[PDB]
Write a protein that binds this ligand. Structure first.
Ligand SMILES: O=C(O)c1ccc2c(c1)N(CC1CCC1)C[C@@]1(CCCc3cc(Cl)ccc31)CO2
Length: 151
């Protein structure tokens, strides 16, 4: 089974859901739990910082995207491919990708479209894993992510 995909989705989905609801998911992690847990703490530390350091730009992009419903949520995939995939890859850009995703997740809860959060996480995961697998594998996937941002 695609273990990198399954782990990426669990990490991305949990962070987005946690950001939108303000509550942690106490369910156990699936495979590679130890790493996923550390990846999630890393995201809470760096991801949260990103949303604040670039709050104005994030607010601006969100406005441009004008997300009001599911169709708008589905249009985000083309934009992620355009902006994220078509560029040099580094952990910072992957953190921005996921961090803005969490920014969007919070928005979805403000407009009572919370059911779109998991489909959004799936879309982010597709872009990340399906267009940057080689890079991710070379950088040791999530173990590498945790090591890169190690305190
Ligand atoms: O600058 C970078 O290194 C960079 C790297 C990645 C990245 C972005 C910028 N952007 C653009 C920025 C401007 C403020 C947010 C958000 C992005 C595009 C817009 C749709 C979208 C939708 C979702 Cl759910 C998540 C990410 C994205 C694509 O992920």
């Amino acid at each position: 089974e695609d273990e990198l995909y399954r782990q990426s989705l669990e990490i991305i989905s949990r962070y987005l859901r946690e950001q939108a609801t303000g509550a942690k998911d106490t369910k156990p992690m699936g495979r590679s739990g130890a790493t996923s847990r550390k990846a999630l703490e890393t995201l809470r530390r760096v991801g949260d910082g990103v949303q604040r350091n670039h709050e104005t730009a994030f607010q601006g992009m969100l406005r441009k995207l004008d997300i009001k419903n599911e169709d708008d949520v589905k249009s985000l995939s083309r934009v992620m491919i355009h902006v994220f995939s078509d560029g040099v890859t580094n952990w910072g850009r992957i953190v921005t990708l996921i961090s803005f995703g969490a920014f969007v997740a919070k928005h979805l809860k403000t407009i009572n479209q919370e059911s779109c959060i998991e489909p959004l996480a799936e879309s982010i995961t597709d872009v990340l894993v399906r267009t940057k697998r080689d890079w991710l594998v070379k950088q040791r996937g999530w173990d590498g992510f945790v090591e890169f941002f190690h305190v």
